[PDB]
């Protein structure tokens, strides 16, 4: 009893007769699944000596100092945009990493330098810095290797927001490695553990990756 459109009206009415939600369990085979689990990133060292860790009053204080410099960079960036600074007018930067390592070691993260870098540059510089901790055959210290720490800070302030997700990832690696570095500290002085504590504070506090809370 259909013509063209008529079968559609035969169907809307056919599905109306139907229970819409049907549930049917066991019957054949079933049983509890053995499964394939999940390949997971291992949680760091919990750590030894919770005394090396910082005071909340300090953490909150160090975050003020960060957010303040961040807001002051924004001020300087707006003043640059008003003076029609075209970021695209910036020539091509090296990808050498070694040419870079020497630059950061020897030149400082002054705003004059840092403001000339695009979000993509900062993005890449951070990946570089990350790899510069993630076992250089160098016995890295941050307290000693100040230029690293100084740059890591700068780079972190500058990063334009929202941050891309792989920037969060390549930041969590920095979190992890200074968690690591710091765990190697005795009591090897509170001040020697100080940089890592800041770069963790930030990660948990500023970049709100709380699945670290308990390492800061």
């Amino acid at each position: 009893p259909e013509s063209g459109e008529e079968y559609l009206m035969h169907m809307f009415y056919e599905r109306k007769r139907c229970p819409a939600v049907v549930t049917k369990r066991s019957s054949k085979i079933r049983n509890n699944t053995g499964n394939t689990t999940l390949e997971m990133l291992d949680n760091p060292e919990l750590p030894p000596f919770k005394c090396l860790l910082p005071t909340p009053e300090w953490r909150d204080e160090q975050v003020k100092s960060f957010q303040a410099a961040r807001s002051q960079v924004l001020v300087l960036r707006k003043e640059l945009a008003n003076n029609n600074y075209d970021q695209s007018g910036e020539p091509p930067l090296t990808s050498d990493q070694e040419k870079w390592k020497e630059f950061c070691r020897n030149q400082q993260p002054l705003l004059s330098t840092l403001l000339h870098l695009t979000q993509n540059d900062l993005e890449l510089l951070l990946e570089m810095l990350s790899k510069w901790l993630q076992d250089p055959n160098t016995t890295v210290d941050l307290l000693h290797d100040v230029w690293l720490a100084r740059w890591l800070y700068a780079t972190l302030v500058c990063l334009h927001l929202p941050l891309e997700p792989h920037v969060f990832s390549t930041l969590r690696y920095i979190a992890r490695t200074c968690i690591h570095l710091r765990n190697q500290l005795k009591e090897d002085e509170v001040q020697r553990a100080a940089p890592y504590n800041l770069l963790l504070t930030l990660t948990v506090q500023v970049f709100a990756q709380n699945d670290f809370k308990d390492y800061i």
Partner: peptide, 17 residues
């Protein structure tokens, strides 16, 4: 405000010592 090109080196240094 405006100047002090050091700033990022200064705020990091003071945030640690």
């Amino acid at each position: 405000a405006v100047w002090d090109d050091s700033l990022l080196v200064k705020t990091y240094d003071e945030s640690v010592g």
